[PDB]
Amino acid sequence: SLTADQMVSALLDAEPPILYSESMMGLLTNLADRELVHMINWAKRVPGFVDLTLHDQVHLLESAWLEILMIGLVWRSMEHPGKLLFAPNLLLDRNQGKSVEGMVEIFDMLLATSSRFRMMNLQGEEFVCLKSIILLNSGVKDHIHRVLDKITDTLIHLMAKAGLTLQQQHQRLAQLLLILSHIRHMSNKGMEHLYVVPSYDLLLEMLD
Amino acid sequence: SLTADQMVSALLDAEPPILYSEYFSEASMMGLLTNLADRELVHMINWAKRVPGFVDLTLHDQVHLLESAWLEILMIGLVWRSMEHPGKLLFAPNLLLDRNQGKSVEGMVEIFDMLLATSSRFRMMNLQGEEFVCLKSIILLNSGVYTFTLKSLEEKDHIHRVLDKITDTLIHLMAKAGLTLQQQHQRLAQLLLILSHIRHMSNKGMEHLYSMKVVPSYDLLLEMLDA
Numbered sequence: 001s002l003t004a005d006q007m008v009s010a011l012l013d014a015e016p017p018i019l020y021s022e023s024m025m026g027l028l029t030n031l032a033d034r035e036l037v038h039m040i041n042w043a044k045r046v047p048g049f050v051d052l053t054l055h056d057q058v059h060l061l062e063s064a065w066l067e068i069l070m071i072g073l074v075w076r077s078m079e080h081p082g083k084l085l086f087a088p089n090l091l092l093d094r095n096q097g098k099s100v101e102g103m104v105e106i107f108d109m110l111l112a113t114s115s116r117f118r119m120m121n122l123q124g125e126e127f128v129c130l131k132s133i134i135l136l137n138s139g140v141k142d143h144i145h146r147v148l149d150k151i152t153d154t155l156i157h158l159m160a161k162a163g164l165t166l167q168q169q170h171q172r173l174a175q176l177l178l179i180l181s182h183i184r185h186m187s188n189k190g191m192e193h194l195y196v197v198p199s200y201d202l203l204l205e206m207l208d
Numbered sequence: 209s210l211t212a213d214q215m216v217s218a219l220l221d222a223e224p225p226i227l228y229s230e231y232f233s234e235a236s237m238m239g240l241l242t243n244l245a246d247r248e249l250v251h252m253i254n255w256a257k258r259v260p261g262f263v264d265l266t267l268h269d270q271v272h273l274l275e276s277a278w279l280e281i282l283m284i285g286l287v288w289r290s291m292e293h294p295g296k297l298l299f300a301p302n303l304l305l306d307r308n309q310g311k312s313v314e315g316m317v318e319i320f321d322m323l324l325a326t327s328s329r330f331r332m333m334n335l336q337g338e339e340f341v342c343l344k345s346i347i348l349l350n351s352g353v354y355t356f357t358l359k360s361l362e363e364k365d366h367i368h369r370v371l372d373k374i375t376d377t378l379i380h381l382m383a384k385a386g387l388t389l390q391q392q393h394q395r396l397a398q399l400l401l402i403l404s405h406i407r408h409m410s411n412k413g414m415e416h417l418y419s420m421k422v423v424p425s426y427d428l429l430l431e432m433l434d435a
């Protein structure tokens with residue numbers, strides 16, 4: 001029932017805080033573990049999410065959690081070319097990733113996504129819609145699609161309010177959604193590198 | 209340069225044929241599927257060369273895009289062929305498999321279930337042939353663009369122009385079908401979100417192929433593209 005402006009306001013308010021770092025992999029694992037709690041707090045404030053069953057809420061988070069960690073990292077790193085801002089006290093370039101096998105490949109995918117965000121001048125209002133789509137789309141039922149349809153309407157609203165023509169609205173919408181396919185691919189490659197997954201019980205306890 | 213009408217027409221004429229298996233036992237099934245996929249790959253090359261704008265790229269970039277997209281294109285073709293056969297995967301007209309036939313190999317049933325679910329999603333959306341060939345062209349151009357110099361920049365800018373062109377073509381098809389603007393935007397998003405699941409399936413399918421101990425080599429794809 002929310003309007004597009006009210007949808008945007010809710011998602012912006014819900015944004016998780018930036019956490020700080022507490023052997024490089026140990027710091028990153030500890031950081032991701034602490035970020036998960038705040039992610040679940042964010043998810044509960046995504047309009048429509050808590051109308052789902054608790055079993056379905058966990059399934060969506062089980063499928064989306066790493067994608068959400070990555071798009072958050074990519075957003076944070078967007079104005080630091082060639083570097084990944086894991087935390088304000090953990091800025092790493094790709095040279096540091098060469099120690100572990102298979103790290104630099106995922107590092108490079110994340111950097112290229114950050115460069116893409118930079119070239120499209122992605123705005124914060126668009127970013128929080130994108131993150132909400134990952135949450136609802138990744139594990140997907142009728143309720144989920146009309147929440148997804150509402151987020152789509154909100155993105156179209158933001159682009160028209162920004163002055164884009166109808167054609168540019170369609171084109172930018174498509175461009176943003178095609179990036180989500182690459183984020184899923186990065187998440188899959190990231191899962192493989194990590195093989196680690198938050199248990200159903202752990203996610204359930206965090207929700208309630 | 210093409211209109212949306214002309215883009216649909218070109219993609220429709222570029223469609224590869226539906227191929228058959230040999231004219232049954234679970235033991236021989238992997239060999240049959242591997243042979244079918246190997247033959248389909250040859251036709252997928254010639255389809256790709258006919259997707260508007262693809263042959264404007266360098267041959268190295270064409271190989272990279274196909275190397276990144278080939279399994280996704282095989283899977284979405286399988287999902288399309290199966291869309292009118294609930295509960296079954298139509299690998300070929302004479303090779304129609306159900307879930308129970310997919311439990312012989314470990315890990316096969318998980319991917320089989322995912323492919324069936326996508327087929328059911330296509331069915332629920334009443335996906336049209338004209339929208340399908342657009343989605344397949346998007347997979348080819350989008351899947352490898354984020355993993356590629358001045359030449360690379362011009363190539364990526366070209367790809368995004370062609371992808372913009374296909375987006376307009378999808379919108380035009382939806383408007384021609386009488387959808388409101390809101391329904392056009394919502395169906396466009398619904399279509400492109402399915403692409404994320406198709407990438408997920410192909411990642412899971414690629415893992416399963418490496419567990420048998422596999423992929424079209426660079427030389428092989430180059431050899432086919434470079435006529």
Ligand SMILES: CN(C)CCOc1ccc([C@@H]2c3ccc(O)cc3CC3(CC3)N2C(=O)c2ccccc2)cc1
Pocket residue numbers: 025028029031032033035069070072073086097102103104106107110190193194196197198
């Ligand atoms: C959850 N527990 C149960 C198990 C741990 O899973 C995790 C999850 C995330 C991480 C880490 C991390 C931390 C914070 C962040 O905001 C984002 C990321 C992203 C990234 C890509 C995935 N990562 C890496 O180190 C990395 C690897 C290879 C290339 C580049 C980066 C580490 C471990």
Ligand SMILES: CN(C)CCOc1ccc([C@@H]2c3ccc(O)cc3CC3(CC3)N2C(=O)c2ccccc2)cc1
Pocket residue numbers: 241242244245246248249282283285286299315316317319320323413416417422423424
């Ligand atoms: C190319 N050579 C060099 C290497 C072999 O690569 C391949 C590639 C594809 C295939 C096959 C196949 C054939 C035709 C088709 O149209 C589609 C598919 C799809 C599918 C999912 C991927 N597959 C499977 O068997 C399968 C596995 C688990 C669940 C369901 C299906 C087999 C081998």
